[PDB]
A paper describes a structure:
Unlike humans, this parasite use a variety of sterols (e.g. ergosterol, 24-ethyl-cholesta-5,7,22-trien-3 beta ol, and its 22-dihydro analogs), rather than cholesterol in their cell membranes, so inhibiting endogenous sterol biosynthesis is an important therapeutic target. The two enzymes share 44% amino acid identity and have the same fold. The [name] protein structure had two major hydrophobic pockets: The S1 allylic binding site in which FSPP([name]) binds to a cluster of highly conserved Asp residues via Mg2+, and a homoallylic S2 binding site to which the second [name] binds via basic residues interacting with the FSPP's diphosphate group.
Other [name] inhibitors that have been discovered include the thiocyanate WC-9 as well as the bisphosphonates ibandronate and incadronate. We also reported the structure of the thiocyanate inhibitor WC-9 bound to CrtM and WC-9 is also known to be an inhibitor of TcSQS. We were unable to obtain diffraction quality crystals of WC-9 bound to TcSQS, but we did obtain the crystal structure of WC-9 bound to [name], as shown in Figure 6A. The crystals of [name] belong to the space group P21 and contain six [name] molecules in the asymmetric unit.
Author numbering:
A (entry chain A), B (entry chain C), C (entry chain B), D (entry chain D), E (entry chain E), F (entry chain F): 36 to 369
The structure:
């Protein structure tokens, strides 16, 4: 009924893409809680990406973003991005944020707050060690997973255990993030953003951008494959997180994004396309089309099938051939 | 293990290739009840469809159909339609009808008595107002939903609320009906038949038949869009209706058609093909292919997904552009 | 973290290409129980198919296989079949077998024992009658269905009844064999092995191999259709069996295969290609693709659909046209 | 089915008055796992209590007990304790230990390795410091709680958290150990042992045995009151650990001992008969007369009732009376 | 962890006993909410009870009690009632009251408003009609049944129906107040207080106080029985009320006191001890000693037994014997 | 609010000492159904028991009991048994029975029929062999278990599997019958009725009544023990049966009887005070008074405890020992 709430769902469908539908499917209060949550995240996300905002002007924005949730007339008109509309009409979003029960307000504010400090910290530095790839991924994605779990339990739709287990919640995020950072290498390159860990790619090329020179494609796919091998290590936690859920609408919201992330890594493994444009998700084995990601056992079968897709395609000469089998074997066994 | 009951199920798969499977999949008593219901609804429709039967013979036939269900020896050997075997051997079908529990017999007969009356009024008329469109659809579709619902509740597999809310039940039918009417424009024109409400197509041309003329495609696709917008207004009741279902066999039976209907609508929206033959229902985003209509949340997700598929295609230049956005916007926030 | 168990799952994915994912999706202790059960079953099957092993040498092996499960150093190094590794590295498999709960061990060994006996007894004779065809099938598939059931009941995941009703368990496996047999006619032909019951093809030709002859192709199909008719009689039992399951992961494990089996019978029915190539699985009505084999009503639906694909293709001119219909008729009225 | 297992349970009942019933009530695999875990822990405890064993001879056995679990023939025929049966027929128990799944095996052994180390360590010394009292309880009680917690999570019947949070797991054991030590003052005093932390009783007397003398019981029921106050500090952790449980059998197994533990501390608080024989638990107030420890809220209620049964008997005259009210007021406010 | 909240619970355990434990065992938000509610209610109760407070002065205090909650400094220093501490330190409680969510404060203050209006209204009279008894109990207990209920629905731990249905929430408070009034007859008389409905006892004696005289015993017992039969009527609502609860902590909070009440009526029925001392509620029995009040079916079984226990003890000659049966019959068969 | 119904519940409490309270606790339609089912069974039993009836007038009555349930004016004012009210006022009961859903009537009638046939079959003969003692118990109690199980599934409060498992359903009944048969040796003898099986006591004494003679008290106990041992052999089915129940009210109804039976068996095991008076249930160990029989793990604790009390008192003297041990250890590992 609200005009503002109506407006928040218009932005949800503008800014989002593949999440709007599963979010709107959420039971009861989560529906609005998660919608507003993604909107503020989308706004804070836009502030970080905007390169026309000097770092000295951006740091204060990121740090205090969370405090703007309580400033009715706050907003940013200087954005140049595409999703800048959530920023220009932020007061509309703030308004509904303050209509949420406060148990949701607390979680949302808290996450924005820690995410702001994290985004700022990385404003003037590229990711080095894998250990930091996890740190940067924890700030832009992990916290979101931790945030969502806390809102699920808050609402009483999921067991309080879901939200308490932050480590695994964090993994849900790290998996979707690394997978995305991996798929978008070229999109982020011809964009001026570098996310691939340096202590990794610096073992194959002089500059992360060199992986776009067809002359280093073989070395590029070796790095892609190493990073993919890395992301895979989060699957076990993923399966543990999902296995805990008891609300269908939540399950769907959570299981789907992960299964597409898996199919994606599968489509990208030892795949040259990653460095020449877009890698299209396809179809693996009959059963994948036979059963759908709406129940736990099925999500497992779907995942194991993608795992084999990669397994069966592991080059014996790949610098990471063995570790790739190691984690895949661990996943399918235990 | 009656031979007549086997005959019945043979006729069902013969005259209901589409819903036959799911009907046979229904639990306990709902099964046979819904099977007979479709056979007697098939028969009545067969008489209506039959153009060789004079209005003089057809009117009493439609009007008294519900009474033929208790006349052990009634039969119609003069039909020239294809599903007429249900009329020539109606005694078998009616034998199984009087075989059901009095409670089902009540619903079915009542629908047949009201459907016959209604089908009779429209024998010599076309649909004029949008009101007459809801009238006709009610007579040939809504009642079906109102009858089906009343059967679901009668059996106690679904709460009484399902059978009570005749308005929601009616919408279930109007959505499907209005949808097929929109999709079948062409083949209905190539069959000397009109269903599109005149008060609407008249504002675009002098004859419903003009939409088939290349020179009027633009006007045709504008009327199409309008009528579609009209149809969209039933979505909330459909979601509401489906949301109340507790039994899986019934959910499967009810959800699939509706999803099929929304997809069909998303496919036709702003598509010139609707006027050049049968239109193609295009795939669905990835969040759909990893889901199917077996649990409510997922069904919302598929629906919401197709409405956005439509929102993306709405052109400012369309006369309905603004109402289409509006109703979709409303379905999005409830 | 057992490396044997890891190796075991490597083999499961090497040998049971398909089932592998649904097996791994099994809950708790059924997973390793079923995985190991498939590995030892596959080994046994590999000794029985290897033809470089004289009959005199093979029986003592088939007979004592169930006891080699307890001989830690036992392995076979003379097989020349493709999945011979399960036999050459059997010590690894029996190691993890002896690690299962003693109650599962009891079950598995009992089936391997009774299975070896059956296999041995059919090395010196081909299948003659249908009664004999069910006997061979019981020995290589029926007992597996019985074994899998006793395991489900023992793990307490399923009702005690699942494992007690052996006739139904028997049917789950018979329906599968008869299928794979009917579909692997050609491949099993050029292999020197004959599985079609002598009493059926004997009254169509003199040599089973004849059907491979592009001339009596029409004689073949008639037989093909007569055997498929034989198979269909198992469905009533598959459905009854699947309708008792209550554990989701177990249902997934059981429904899927049965569903692919029926889809295959549909594809093959009246298809001349069964005798010329690899009949591939076709699609199912838009209503089939809307569901998945994960709930009982959907399975019943999918199955019924595949029933129709067969039912309205039955040529009157076929020797089995009347039985092919009485059975599909009986299936529609359970 | 196996005799070895039947024997283990015969021993489970000979060594455990009450506990054998609740362990035997554990679901699926944690039943056998805990029955074996308790038998080896008993055998270990037996070796540790047998005085007719040279320290120079006992230290190795305690440091090496964990390893005998892998030696089929190991056993000890030179004990003269009440439960030597588990020592003389340890091969029977060790056999069933190696039949448990590898994952329960690593837990049980690892805890025997660590337990047996601490046991040996407190052979030549006595409990001095209070945090040394915590250290002792950890080696004979804490670790068992930590062990069981790992078995519960390893079996998936309980959440991963239950096993991961070793701190709360530990308190579970510390609470039962201190309550049991306090209650058995006289018993442990005629047997020739001293578990009461020296740094505590020393402030009140010169020899722990002094508390037994009539002319001292006023410094004895001040020391006793001071310990209970310490133990009381574990409750918050006991509520947290019990609150994470979701399986009924495990909840009954965990909740009862703890409840029986508080009741004991509330029957011994500022009571004199503690130093004049053992103490009895005569019923729990009305609310605790209508509810048993099967659900979490009941358990809390029950626990709070005993806190107040203590809060009332706190004589302002007592020295710890202050922090005693402090801990109690804390346990109830959160 | 506020010392103000710490003390609030100190008083909770100080004033309420049969509630302190279960209140503190309430889930999340309703814990502190209910705690505080019971504190102000006790404060208001203490006032309407202090006889050292001339009217004129009292009326105001009761009327303006709900307003003292928002007046940070308010407090009563002239109370000579044991509980006075909750008034003298009322600020501490008003402090924590204002810390609660708004919707909880809405309920608390609204009840305290009405409760005071009624209390003052009875300052100048005695309960005459049976109606007057029902509504005196409405102002001091029914409203507390309604208060809590609304707090249960606000926290959303219970459906909205619980807080909606005021009649049921009314019978809950009326069953206790009456049970206590009946049982607390003597004590009240010696306290110079009268609550028994005059139009009832006046038919037996000239003054309510006559039941204290040994000579009037028999007649006193018949009145006791007429009142007891009166209270037995709220039982159908009680069972109904408890049937709708879904939260375990809430069920405990509600079932317990009610089951405690029946137990007391069963104990006082036709028991002349009720006029000489206090009655010791004769514990459960063979089937009620097998259960507790943590699940509806159990509670019912418990309720029904105490009913038969009263039934089989009804003397034919008892003036009310005919109704005590009529009602007990209703409860059985409903 | 039905007069005849209120009468039925009045007869339920008269005839049924205890079950009455739990029966009235059943959910929805089971409440009246079982009450009614209990009443007709109390009637049909009163007949058989009546020894002031012929044997040629008793048979038809028994053989035709089930028929009377459809004869409004039926009644039997000729019985001289304690519960003759159910016979003399049978129309009040039949009327209500005819109020039950058809599905319920179906079951109950059927049970009465099959039952009568068995009852009539045993007045001519005596229980000779055990396989016959099972037959009798089957006819007078096992069938009741089957009936109840069916009504449970029919009601849909329990999975269809509950009612489909007639074997364990039978054990439920047999375990009880054998219990009361054993406990009531004198009562049944001082009534001229013999129920103990020949082959058992026969190998002990000549006059089955000899056990009432102080000269063979041993021989009486050893037989007693021998029979108990035969009875304990049903517990596994009992534990399994209860393990299948999902409805609380249904569980309380089933579990409690069983728990009391086992209570009695242990109460009477190797106890001579059985052939000289009524033996009544003692108390349970520590753990039990913390366990109401309302959840399965709890019930298991209780059963395993009683199994233990018996085990501890098995004399090496008694002949049937070893068997008593053999069976009890088997229960320990379920
Ligand atoms: N804006 C922005 S950033 C959006 C992408 O980062 C995410 C996304 C999801 C998420 O956790 C989920 C948990 C379960 C399923 C799906 C998601 C954590 C991090
Ligand atoms: N290796 C080898 S032999 C594999 C083929 O034999 C089967 C296969 C499955 C089965 O039962 C199942 C029950 C339901 C679904 C799938 C299986 C019984 C016999």
């Amino acid at each position: 009924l609200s005009s503002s709430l109506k407006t928040c769902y218009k932005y949800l469908n503008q800014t989002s893409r593949s999440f709007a539908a599963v979010i709107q499917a959420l039971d009861g209060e989560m529906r609005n809680a998660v919608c507003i949550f993604y909107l503020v995240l989308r706004a804070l996300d836009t502030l970080e990406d905007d390169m026309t905002i000097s770092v000295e002007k951006k740091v204060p924005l990121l740090h205090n973003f969370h405090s703007f949730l309580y400033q009715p007339d706050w907003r940013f008109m200087e954005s140049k991005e595409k999703d800048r509309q959530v920023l220009e009409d932020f007061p509309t979003i703030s308004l509904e944020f303050r209509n949420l029960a406060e148990k949701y307000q607390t979680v949302i504010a808290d996450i924005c707050r820690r995410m702001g400090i994290g985004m700022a910290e990385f404003l003037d530095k590229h990711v080095t060690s894998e250990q930091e790839w996890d740190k940067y991924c924890h700030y832009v994605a992990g916290l979101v997973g931790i945030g969502l779990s806390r809102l699920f339990s808050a609402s009483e739709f999921e067991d309080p255990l879901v939200g308490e287990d932050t480590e695994r919640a964090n993994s849900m995020g790290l998996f979707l993030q690394k997978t995305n950072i991996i798929r978008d290498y070229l999109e982020d390159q011809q964009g001026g953003r570098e996310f691939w860990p340096q202590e990794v790619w610096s073992r194959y090329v002089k500059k992360l951008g060199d992986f776009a020179l067809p002359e280093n494609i073989d070395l590029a796919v070796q790095c892609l494959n190493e990073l993919i091998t890395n992301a895979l290590h989060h699957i076990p936690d993923v399966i543990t997180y999902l296995s805990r859920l008891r609300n269908q609408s939540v399950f769907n919201f959570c299981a789907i994004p992960q299964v597409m992330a898996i199919a994606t890594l599968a489509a990208c493994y030892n795949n040259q396309q990653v460095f020449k444009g877009a890698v299209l998700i396809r179809l693996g084995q009959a059963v994948t089309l036979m059963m759908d990601a709406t129940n736990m056992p099925a999500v497992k079968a779907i995942i194991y099938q993608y795992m084999e897709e990669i397994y069966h395609r592991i080059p014996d000469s790949n610098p990471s051939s063995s570790k790739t089998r190691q984690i895949i074997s661990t996943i399918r066994t235990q």
